[PDB]
Amino acid sequence: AGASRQRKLEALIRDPRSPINVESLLDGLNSLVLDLDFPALRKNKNIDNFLNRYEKIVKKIRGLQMKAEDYDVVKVIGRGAFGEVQLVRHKASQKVYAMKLLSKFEMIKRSDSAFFWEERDIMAFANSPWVVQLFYAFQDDRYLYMVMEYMPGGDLVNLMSNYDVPEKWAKFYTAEVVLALDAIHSMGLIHRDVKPDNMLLDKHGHLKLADFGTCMKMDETGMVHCVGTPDYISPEVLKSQGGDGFYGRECDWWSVGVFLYEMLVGDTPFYADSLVGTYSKIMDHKNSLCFPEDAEISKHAKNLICAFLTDREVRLGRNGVEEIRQHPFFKNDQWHWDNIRETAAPVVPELSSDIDSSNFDDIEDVETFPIPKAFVGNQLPFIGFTYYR
């Protein structure tokens, strides 16, 4: 009946995962207002009269909703392709978060614009201690904001540059990465850009993955038809960039092997001065993968590294994560796969307060959209991005 219909649609609006939830529909009207309030378009009677009604309530609404002015910015802890990351303190609650800003301009211009949906879903609804939790997602006219839990231990790029990593440490950080990727794979997602920059460390020095712009949802077969600095990117993913090309979750396990090599060796296995150099070496990995004479690595460590860095058809982890996690290398008298994250981490950070950012390096140093004549609708891609947990 009509009563049954209104019950059904009210379910579609209260659903926080729905595209027509109240935050999306409020995003829709706010995106419509921002996209229309220009003097050139206001010559149109339909557009000017529409703004006359809603201009008042839209300014009110935007005041009540969560915004950047609510958060005191303590420091900038990272920079990235489409923006930056800030250490922030929410003023009303005094709680410390890490807030990621992604530029709407840069996303629209350089033309990626769909990566942030999966990132937002994964961080909100992953519900895994291997993935950084998102608390709030919101936006203004220039930026998207993602308010995440603050990983105060820094990343593994910092850990490797400040410590010469022994093999017992390498077992730990590799095992945690394996578990973290298994978490993502189990959500039906291929990471396809795993690397120490995206591997953060929590309060107790335990790993959580932190960037998911590259993530993509798998098929029934498990494959994913569809960019970057190629250091950690597998051969098949590299070949795939040339036109079409299928690949699966094994591409992430290549990256793990690259990551294992780096920790024990100190350089990436396919390092070169140019991108074409690195690309070229990654394709000729059968001949170009080699260990230095003066880099004391064990038989099992070398065996695992060689297991991962091979063709996809015989790589470690086609048959499953099992054979990876029962490789001899991981045998130890400290932790087990079922209890690793509650055991003592190799490196616990010594921090003084809730805003201690000492394990992050310092960051040093504008343009936005042009005023349009016609309707371009730049805000339309960002409708339904707002999320309040």
Selecting among 27, 193, 202, 252, the annotated active-site residue is 193
The verdict on 1 binding its own copies (CB under 8 A) reads: yes
25: helix, coil or strand? helix
Q: What residue is closest to ligand 3SG based on CB?
A: 80
**Smallest gap from residue 109 Cβ to its own copies (A):** 12
Closest CA to 174 of 305, 12, 344: 305
- Taking 3-state DSSP, the helix, strand and coil percentages for the chain, each rounded to the nearest 5, stand at 45, 15, 45
C-alpha pair distances (Å), 158 with each of 13, 26, 123, 296, 360: 44, 41, 23, 22, 7
Q: How many residues bind ligand 3SG (CB under 6 A)?
A: 28
- Told to judge if 193 belongs to the known catalytic residues of this protein, a careful annotator would answer yes
Asked if 258 interacts with ligand 3SG (CB under 6 A), we say no
Q: For residues 161 and 158, give the distance between their C-alpha atoms in angstroms, rounded to a whole number.
A: 5
Backbone angles phi, psi at 5, to 5 degrees: -65, -50
**According to the binding rule CB under 6 A, does residue 122 interact with ligand 3SG?**
no
Binding site per annotation, positions: 77-85, 100
Q: How far apart are CA 139 and CA 148, in angstroms?
A: 14
Cα distance between residue 331 and residue 337, in whole Å: 10
| Size (the chain), residues | 389
Binding residues for ligand 3SG restricted to 175-204, rule: CB under 6 A: 193, 197-198, 200
Q: Is 228 in the site for ligand 3SG (CB under 6 A)?
A: yes
211 near ligand 3SG (CB under 6 A): yes
The closest alpha carbon to 263, from 335, 312, 207, 195, belongs to 195
One-letter amino acid for residue 358 of the chain:
S
* Nearest to ligand 3SG of 33, 200 (CB atom): 200
Binding residues for ligand 3SG restricted to 84-113, rule: CB under 6 A = 84-85, 98, 100, 102, 112
Residues 50 to 109 in contact with its own copies, rule: CB under 8 A: 50, 53-54, 57, 60-61, 64-66, 70, 92-93, 108
Residue 356 within binding range of ligand 3SG, rule CB under 6 A: no
Cβ-based nearer residue to its own copies, 44 or 326: 44
Interface segment toward its own copies; rule CB under 8 A; list 46-54, 119-127, 282-290, 332-340: 46-54
Q: Is 294 helix (H, G, I), strand (E, B) or coil?
A: coil
Q: Describe the crossing of helices 45-64 and 22-36 by its angle, rounded to 10 degrees.
A: 130
Q: Which residues contact 382 (CB under 8 A, 6 or more apart)?
A: 27, 31, 104, 139, 144
Tokens of 98: 């890490």
CB of 302 to ligand 3SG, least distance (A): 29
For its own copies, the binding residues (CB under 8 A) are: 1-2, 5-6, 8-9, 12-13, 18-20, 22, 25-26, 28-29, 32, 36, 44, 46-47, 49-50, 53-54, 57, 60-61, 64-66, 70, 92-93, 108, 113-114, 374-378, 380-381, 383-384, 388
For ligand 3SG, the binding residues (CB under 6 A) are: 77-78, 80-85, 98, 100, 102, 112, 115, 132, 148, 150-151, 193, 197-198, 200, 210-211, 213-214, 227-229
